Structures are given as structure tokens and as C-alpha cells.
Amino acid sequence: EEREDCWTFYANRKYTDFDKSFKKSSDLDECKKTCFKTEYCYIVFEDTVNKECYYNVVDGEELDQEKFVVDENFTENYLTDCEGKDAGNAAGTGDESDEVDED
């Protein structure tokens, strides 16, 4: 749906581990839908190069951007202070940190 969960972008990051269990299919819609689906609805990891979407389907509320280190080929965006829809749109996924072009 056009009312998404709003993912707040902070930085290109990874703490170099994907144990939190993510699934990758890149459909913006699919990702929202997956987010809305679990409990957690909150962390999403995107592959900057492949333009892919991994959605965190488990509790990783403790995944903090600032304890996270930079994985250059990934963009990290997490639902920050939304927990509802109403007007849900947030185009910031891989938007911050321009290296080559817009990435």
C-alpha cells in the first residue's frame, strides 16, 4: 500500500553480521509489507550496489547506527519514531552518503 512504514536513514553501515535474519526480495511494497507483517517492523538493510532490499524480520532494535561500522555497499535505514501509518512515506533509503553519483 502507499502508506508505508517510515524508515529513517542514518548512514551506510554494517556491524559486519547478518545473524538478525533478513530476507531479500526487492520490492519496495514487499519490504513494507514484510515490515508491517512481523512484530518488530523496523530494520531494513539495502544493498547499495545491487540495489537490493533486505528486511529485518527479527528484533534488532538494538542495532544502533553508531556502534555499527561502515559497510560501503550497504545502506542502513531503520523505522525511527513512526510505529503507525497515517501518512507514510519516507524516501531516504540509501539516500544519505553520496560517493560516486547519488551513491
At 78, give phi and psi (nearest 5°).
-140, 140
Experimental method: NMR
- Domain boundaries, given as residue ranges, for the chain: 1-103
CB contact set of 55 (below 8 Å; sequence gap of 6+):
22, 23, 24, 31, 34, 35, 43, 44, 45
CA distance 71 to 4: 26
Q: What is the CA radius of gyration of the chain?
A: 13
Greatest Cα pair distance in the chain:
36
**What is 1-103's CATH number?**
3.50.4.10
- SS3 of 32-74: the string is HHHHHHCCCCCEEEEECCCCEEEEECCCCCCCCCCCCECCCCE
CB contact set of 6 (below 8 Å; sequence gap of 6+):
79, 80, 82, 88, 89, 90
